[PDB]
A paper describes a structure:
IgE plays a central role in the molecular and cellular mechanisms of allergy, and is a validated therapeutic target in the development of new approaches to treat allergic diseases such as asthma. It exerts its effects through its two principal receptors, FcεRI on mast cells, basophils and antigen-presenting cells, and CD23/FcεRII on B cells. The Cε3 domain is thus the critical domain for receptor binding. A branched, bi- or tri-antennary, high-mannose type carbohydrate chain ((GlcNAc)n(Man)n) is N-linked to Asn394 in each Cε3 domain, as seen in previous crystal structures of IgE-Fc and Fcε3–4 at different resolutions, and with varying degrees of disorder.
Numbering used by the authors:
A (entry chain A): 336 to 365, 370 to 424, 427 to 544
B (entry chain B): 336 to 362, 369 to 422, 429 to 544
Write the structure that this text describes.
């Protein structure tokens, strides 16, 4: 029975402007989740989700909407996990410390033998702080569904700053409609709109 | 009290030809090896260190025979204060496709460049990534590699990152990204060079 409490994605916080936090309870034995704010102020209604897993574990998640300004101005949120009558407290707040905007480099790999129809696009995003980042790919100025790319977890560079890589597979028809895809990073330290974007062309 | 058992790195298995397997225990603890075939195991090395978060990490590294491992032996690590087992991966094989590239100079950092490597479409997941400069292997701490992730279709991919300084590429603009993998032919290595400028 462990619990995990996430921060809002940069995308939800700065672009969609409706941030949420999630409390995730992996219950090894088939539970109330209670939200509160350190400031003492009221919390919104939360959404409780539960599901038996493919290994027989019960998973419970509660998703709480939070105010944008509240979150950016340093509010702490608390998830309390209890049974009918000991408890587990998780809390989350924005990260402190120095800020640094991400640097974005997008690349297209050449044709590998035997797959004339598919190209791989890659994006290196590095030297940002703190490590919360959202990565999106755009094609023809429209944002692609999140499930079409995968992004690695942030790792520490040698000095300061984190880096992630993102991967996008494109078909021949996509780059032949227009040969410009965009890798966009959403991060709190990027100015002035909290986004940094770079284009790449297949041929 | 978590326990993990790791297969040999392809580098140790196919290049060095001295593969090891590692039993990692996080949070005295007895760590005992056995072979499924019943044969004896070699002498292992127990490492113990306290971490910053007050937990104690115990690892045991066990040398294994190369032919034994490649022909399908199953090894077991049992923990005593709970067992884990490991064996060569089975299934379809596919060689890694390697692409190495250099980032353009980022405004401000004129003395540094980032080399990166994409390696994808390989099966199974075990892979070793190394960087060479002027045909000499760089120390492993110079680079970092992501964990193998499943592709949308068939295969896995990893990314590797190597920061280099101005003096390095000016004296030779030949860096090589080399993958060691069981399905790569020949000699289980595939590699691709990149130049900065
Ligand atoms: C039965 O099967 C279920 C389903 O697979 C297992 O549930 C998984 O349990 C593990 C840990 O017990 C969970 O891993 C943890 O996930 C946390 C949340 O990650 C999600 O959300 C973030 C956004 O905040 C995404 O980036 C991420 O990709 C996930 O979507 C992480 O925060 C945790 O990381 C911390 O712990 C790890 C060690 O595990 C450290 O290495 C990290 O540094 C970090 O401190 C952690 O990774 C996993 O999410 C669960 N899967 C679910 C809910 O689908 C059961 O464990 C399994 N039961 C048994 C007995 O095997
Ligand atoms: C106090 O601080 C210490 C030091 O950071 C923590 O120790 C870590 O504990 C976690 C426990 O979850 C360990 O995480 C596990 O490590 C396994 C070892 O992997 C080795 O091989 C890989 C190659 O792939 C290396 O990259 C890696 O660094 C190791 O050398 C992983 O195999 C485990 O992976 C599991 O989850 C992933 C996805 O999340 C799956 O793909 C795997 O199949 C597997 O299910 C896992 O990541 C971590 O290695 C420990 N580090 C050290 C240095 O000891 C303590 O946990 C921490 N204490 C507390 C209470 O937080």
């Amino acid at each position: 029975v462990s619990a995990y409490l996430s921060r809002p994605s940069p995308f939800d916080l700065f672009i969609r402007k409706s941030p949420t936090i999630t409390c995730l309870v992996v219950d090894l034995a088939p539970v109330q989740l209670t939200w509160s704010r350190a400031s003492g102020k009221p919390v919104q209604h939360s959404t409780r989700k539960e599901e038996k897993q493919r290994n027989g574990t019960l998973t419970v998640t509660s998703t709480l909407p939070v105010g944008t300004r509240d979150w950016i101005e340093g509010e702490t949120y608390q998830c309390r996990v209890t049974h009918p009558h000991r408890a587990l407290m998780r809390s989350t707040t924005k990260t402190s410390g120095p800020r640094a905007a991400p640097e974005v480099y997008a690349f297209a790999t050449p044709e590998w033998p035997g797959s004339r129809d598919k190209r791989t696009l890659a994006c290196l995003i590095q030297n940002f702080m703190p490590e919360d980042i959202s990565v999106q790919w755009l094609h023809n100025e429209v944002q692609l569904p999140d499930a079409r790319h995968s992004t690695t977890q942030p790792r520490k560079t040698k000095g300061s700053g984190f880096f992630v890589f993102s991967r996008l597979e494109v078909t021949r028809a996509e780059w032949e409609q227009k040969d410009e895809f965009i890798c966009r990073a959403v991060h709190e330290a990027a100015s002035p709109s909290q986004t940094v974007q770079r284009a790449v062309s297949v041929n």
